[PDB]
Amino acid sequence: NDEIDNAKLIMKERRFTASYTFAKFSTGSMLLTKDIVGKSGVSIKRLPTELQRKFLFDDVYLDKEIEKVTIEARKSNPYPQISESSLLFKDALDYMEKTSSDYNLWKLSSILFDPVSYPYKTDNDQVKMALLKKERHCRLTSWIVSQIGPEIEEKIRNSSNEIEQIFLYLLLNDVVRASKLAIESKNGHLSVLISYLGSNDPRIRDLAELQLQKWSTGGCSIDKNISKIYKLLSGSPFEGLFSLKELESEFSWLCLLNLTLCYGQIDEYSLESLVQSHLDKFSLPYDDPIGVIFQLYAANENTEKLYKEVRQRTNALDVQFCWYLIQTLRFNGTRVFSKETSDEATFAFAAQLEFAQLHGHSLFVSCFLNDDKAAEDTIKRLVMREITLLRASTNDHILNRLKIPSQLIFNAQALKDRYEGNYLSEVQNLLLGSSYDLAEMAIVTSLGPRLLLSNNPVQNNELKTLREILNEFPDSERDKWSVSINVFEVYLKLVLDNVETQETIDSLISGMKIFYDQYKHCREVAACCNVMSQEIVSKILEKNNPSLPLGQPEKAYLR
């Protein structure tokens, strides 16, 4: 009516246009949107993961990681960190769905960024390195070889010439079938002439280049098949008169990395430079997850810097994989990474887990964080928020025994389960909690508004045992005392005894008068001081007061 014009005017001073919604955060970091299906009139929308991985809902994967990392209690801040990361990429070959090319991503990191196993001994430190070089190379090339296997046979059916069948059965590596048709094309030197996988010879390099150059002279029908044979043979599979950047479809980019890696001369020039030597001619996929692994292998010490670049564009280094890579190798100091990129990957990852709704899996990611402030206060804040996730499995109690200074989750329980109905239940488990201090006058803001008990000499002797918890607490500077808190304990000695006290016995009418200069929080903490006056009549003469409601305070109690 006029309440239309009124409401208008108020939200001129709020300046709101009338049609209000809001989005808030709850306690698991998810949204609360106004939708009139709620009984508040708001309903919770559970926020979804930045990147979905299947084994960030797998408890086994998390507890494996705990047991494959060196947990410290950090010397600066006891709240737990990680000294050294003994992570491996074969931890994710226990887990991950096995038909994603994620499994392929995990597989590829295992061969490169976790180094070969060495079962040989050497007598020279020049062959020490060569044997580790060949071992990683065949590993590398056997994984490539299986994943080009179909792609080799496609280009077998996209050709038809007999030298093509010899040439391409050599790359799919089946020498006994390679020379079979070489007998029927009339060859005894081209039947094998692709076979340099562990052979380096500088002479045939020369042969392959001269062979190109005689054919160029104008006219004559010269084989462009024998020219690919002598392209692989020259030691330089692009340069010359003929080239493999004119084959954009009679080989794939992935077969081409293999051609540079084994027919650039495996051991005459290093591995990773020839990986980079492919990535000059061609720029690899950002959306095939295995393409990116060979870029960040093409880059050695600029792995950290290619990560920041590929990331400006589409990601296949998306936040789980980069997290795993940087946090293995920056603790190790084998591949360099910036400590600031370390911090962004870690932090970003804890966000995705808090869309995953797991407080513990996040708590463990704060451990890799070694900024002393962040890995103090992220740990505190998690624990007092959602206590309830942290108790639920025995994986959860190994999150609760990183080097948790268990007791911390118990000191957040008695802050959590506290409510105003059962204030006294958990302020009791601050008192009897017995790792606390300053619960000594806090029990007095529960048991002052209801000095109701169960009022026998077993509850009162039990309440003796409760004011001895007071002295169990550590003793503070200028705080902690028991010379006015034994007031309520010398009360439990004049309530099992009759004897009129002129303070021949007690500090308790004095103790009430101190308790009308003490009462702090609440004026029913001041009026209980008036109620405990009344429960002790003929045992005092009332130099305090008994407890608008006047009609019957009783002004006669003296003798």
Binding site: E13, S40, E354, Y419, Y519
Partner: protein, 274 residues
């Protein structure tokens, strides 16, 4: 009412929720899911209710409640029943903010009002409200969020359009004017400081100009840097802003219902995210 809802904010536990409206009440609807449960309807107000906030828990859960009439009602459960234990009514005009101090700091509710005033409610020794009157904006102070530790600190949002940062000193006893910001040209709605768990705070200082200017501090000792959520006037006008406890993700709902999960990426681009 529950259909032109203007606030619904939870406690730090996330188990208790208090929703207000144009109902002239505070219908307490705690979180049991998308079902919530009435415990009491608190009548004490006259006129539209704007903001409530439960206490941060180390000094109870204690519901303030600010409203048209002039009144901030301190409600507290005391022996399983409620009782308005103080009244904090030192204002005449529309009271527009109530936000408790976080339980990294002590008992310091922050009341703000478009009468010109901020009021730093000092809880005395029976819970007896006593404010020190300060001014931030002299058209009216429409909002007031706290700055926790990513001494005491807060932020207020202008009806003068300025977003003034306020920082406590104990040799002058009040909030020293730390700095003054302005990229705004119609009035501020909500000034939301981020609770990041590390050195970083962005401030989505929400404005009526159909724009929200995200001031950014990359680390706290980096300065306030002008960036925009997007670099155009929005079709409609923009409402309540929040920042997460861990991740620092923006969340706002628009007039057309612009869902916002646009967090600042590497490249410095407020980038859509989960």
């Amino acid at each position: 009412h529950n259909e032109l809802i203007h606030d619904a904010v939870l406690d730090y536990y996330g188990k208790r929720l208090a929703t207000c409206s144009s109902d002239k009440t505070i219908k307490i609807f705690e979180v049991e899911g998308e079902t919530h449960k009435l415990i009491d309807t608190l009548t004490g107000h006259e006129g539209p209710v704007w903001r409530v906030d439960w206490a941060h828990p180390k000094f109870g859960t204690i519901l303030a409640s600010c409203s048209y009439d002039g009144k901030v009602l301190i409600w507290k459960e005391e022996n399983g029943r409620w009782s308005q234990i103080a009244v904090h009514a030192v204002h005449s005009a529309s009271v527009n903010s109530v936000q408790w101090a976080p339980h990294e700091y002590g008992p310091l509710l922050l009341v703000a009002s478009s009468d010109g005033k901020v009021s730093v409610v000092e809880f005395k020794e029976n819970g007896t409200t006593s404010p020190i009157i300060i001014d931030a904006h002299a058209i009216g102070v429409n909002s007031a969020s706290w700055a926790p530790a990513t001494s005491r600190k807060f932020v207020t949002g202008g009806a003068d359009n300025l977003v003034k940062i306020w920082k406590y000193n104990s040799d002058a006893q009040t909030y020293v004017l730390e700095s003054t910001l302005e990229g705004h040209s119609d009035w501020v709605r909500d000034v939301a400081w981020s609770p990041t768990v590390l050195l970083r705070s962005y401030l989505a200082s929400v404005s009526q100009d159909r724009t929200c200017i995200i001031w950014t501090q990359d680390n706290e000792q980096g300065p306030w840097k002008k960036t925009l959520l997007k670099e155009e006037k929005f079709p409609d006008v923009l409402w309540r802003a929040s920042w997460s406890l861990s991740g620092n993700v923006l969340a706002l709902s628009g007039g057309d219902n612009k869902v916002t999960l646009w967090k600042e990426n590497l490249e410095g681009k407020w980038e859509p995210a989960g």
